[PDB]
Amino acid sequence: PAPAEVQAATLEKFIQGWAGWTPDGFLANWSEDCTQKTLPFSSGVPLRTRADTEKLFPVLMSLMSNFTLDIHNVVHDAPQGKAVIYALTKADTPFGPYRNEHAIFLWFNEIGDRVQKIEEMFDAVVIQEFLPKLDKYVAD
Amino acid sequence: MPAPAEVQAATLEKFIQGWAGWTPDGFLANWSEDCTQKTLPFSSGVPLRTRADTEKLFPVLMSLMSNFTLDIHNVVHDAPQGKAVIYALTKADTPFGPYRNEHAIFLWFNEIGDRVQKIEEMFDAVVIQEFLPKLDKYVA
Ligand SMILES: COC(=O)c1cc(C)cc(O)c1C(=O)c1c(O)cccc1O
């Protein structure tokens, strides 16, 4: 894997792209083959490709305003090219305040300048429930 | 400063082995006497467990799940920070049907590096929080 300081720079940019709460900014640090997989595996939530995320995050980020990201724990394994972030998110929607918490497992690419794989344990009800309901709305 | 990386890694290995062994004394041998456990997410408000609390828990729990298996999916070790994360999948048989769980478990080592000092654990907490205390009503 890449040197620790190269990986660490990517890890920091990943976090600031998330905190920036824009689709292009967040995806800037994905590799081209990067995927996101919701945990636990038992929930059977389909993998998200980079393209899936480009289509999904504009509406999702528009729904949640005043987004703030609290980084509670960062664990960086430079010899393995891996990291974990525990993050707490807060936002507003018309349905009131919004909160989530994420245990996000990251793999860096070999060059070390991108995130190549994400596995994420979080409250997935929005992508599990509310999103089959948009598929049918644009279907209608 | 943190313990030697090599010792932390060995403690991580032993912690996993004590978990897999599915006995109270075997698993808690790798917890410091002051070790605490915190169920994640924080929004669930589950009170911190002391080591003593956990010593009362694990006996009847481990007694109720048979053929316990522990599969280690991901280990992320930050030796400079004296921390690690494990992603693990567990299964067991119970008289009510099969048990499955998955755990994103954040660990901190003690100064010598031969014990885990602090645990924060994202997992399905329903059995511990809902099923086990229905047996607290039984005792009384
Ligand atoms: C627009 O979403 C993101 O930027 C996002 C970002 C990261 C690092 C993890 C996520 O899980 C999400 C997300 O998908 C999401 C969601 O699906 C529902 C609510 C809040 C969220 O942050």
CA distance to partner chain B, nearest, from residue A124 (Å): 13
Name the residue with tokens 């994400």: A118
CATH value of A4-139 in 3.40.50.720, 3.20.20.20, 3.40.50.2300, 3.10.450.50:
3.10.450.50
Measured between beta carbons, which residues in chain A are less than 8 angstroms from residue B124? 40
- Is residue B41 less than 8 Å (CB to CB) from chain A? yes
Tell me the C-alpha distance between B34 and A103, whole Å: 25
- Give the three-state DSSP class for A129: helix
Give the CATH fold of the B5-139 domain. Nuclear Transport Factor 2; Chain: A, (3.10.450)
For residue A16, what are its two tokens?
Answer: 């600031």
How many secondary structure helices (H) and strands (E) does chain A include? 5, 5
**DSSP track, B37-79:** EEEEPGGG-PPPBPHHHHHHHHHHHHHH-EEEEEEEEEEEEEG
- CB distance A110 to A1 below 8 Å: yes
CA distance to partner chain A, nearest, from residue B59 (Å): 26
The pairing of strands A96-108 and A65-77 is unpaired
The pairing of strands B116-123 and B31-40 is parallel
For residue B17, what are its two tokens?
Answer: 């082995």
Kind plus residue range of the DSSP H or E element containing A55: helix A50-63
Cα dist from B87 to A39, A53, A121, whole Å? 10, 24, 10
Say if the Cβ atoms of B106 and A76 lie within 8 Å. no
Q: In chain B, what is the greatest distance between 2 CA atoms, to the nearest angstrom?
A: 48
Tell me the C-alpha distance between A23 and A17, whole Å: 9
Q: List the resolution, Å.
A: 1.6
- CB distance A67 to B8 below 8 Å: no
Tell me the C-alpha distance between B128 and A75, whole Å: 27
Cα dist from A97 to A59, A67, A91, A92, whole Å? 18, 10, 6, 5
- To test ligand 1's pocket by mutation, which of A43, A102, A118, A121 has the most ligand atoms within 8 angstroms of CB? A102
Q: What is the dihedral of CA A78, A79, A82, A85, to 10 degrees?
A: -40
For residue B79, what are its two tokens?
Answer: 């030796």
Tell me the C-alpha distance between B101 and A27, whole Å: 31
Q: What are phi and psi of A130, to 5 degrees?
A: -70, -15
Q: What distance in angstroms lies between residue B108's CA and the mean position of ligand 1's atoms? A: 27
Percentages (nearest 5) of helix, strand, coil residues in chain A: 40, 40, 20
- Is residue B131 less than 8 Å (CB to CB) from chain A? no
Q: What distance in angstroms lies between residue A137's CA and the mean position of ligand 1's atoms? A: 21
Tell me the C-alpha distance between A135 and A120, whole Å: 23
**Domain locations in chain B as residue ranges:** 5-139
The residues near B18 (Cβ < 8 Å, ≥ 6 apart) are B26, B27, B28, B29, B30
b/e per residue, A17-55, with b = 16+ CB within 10 A?
A: bbbebebeebbebbbeebbbebbbeeeebeebeeeebee
Number of CB pairs, chain A paired with chain B, less than 8 A apart: 66
Tell me the C-alpha distance between A2 and B123, whole Å: 32
Show contacts of B7-12: CB within 8 Å, 24+ apart.
B7/B112, B7/B113, B7/B114, B8/B77, B8/B79, B8/B82, B8/B84, B8/B109, B8/B113, B9/B77, B9/B79, B11/B109, B11/B113, B11/B114, B11/B115, B11/B116, B12/B75, B12/B77, B12/B84, B12/B86, B12/B107
E strands, A78-135, are: 82-93, 96-108, 115-122
Neighbours of B46 (CB within 10 A): 16
Cα dist from A131 to A50, A62, A138, whole Å? 17, 14, 11
Tell me the C-alpha distance between A88 and A100, whole Å: 6
Kind plus residue range of the DSSP H or E element containing A25: helix A23-27
CA angle B38, B117, A69 (to 5 degrees): 50
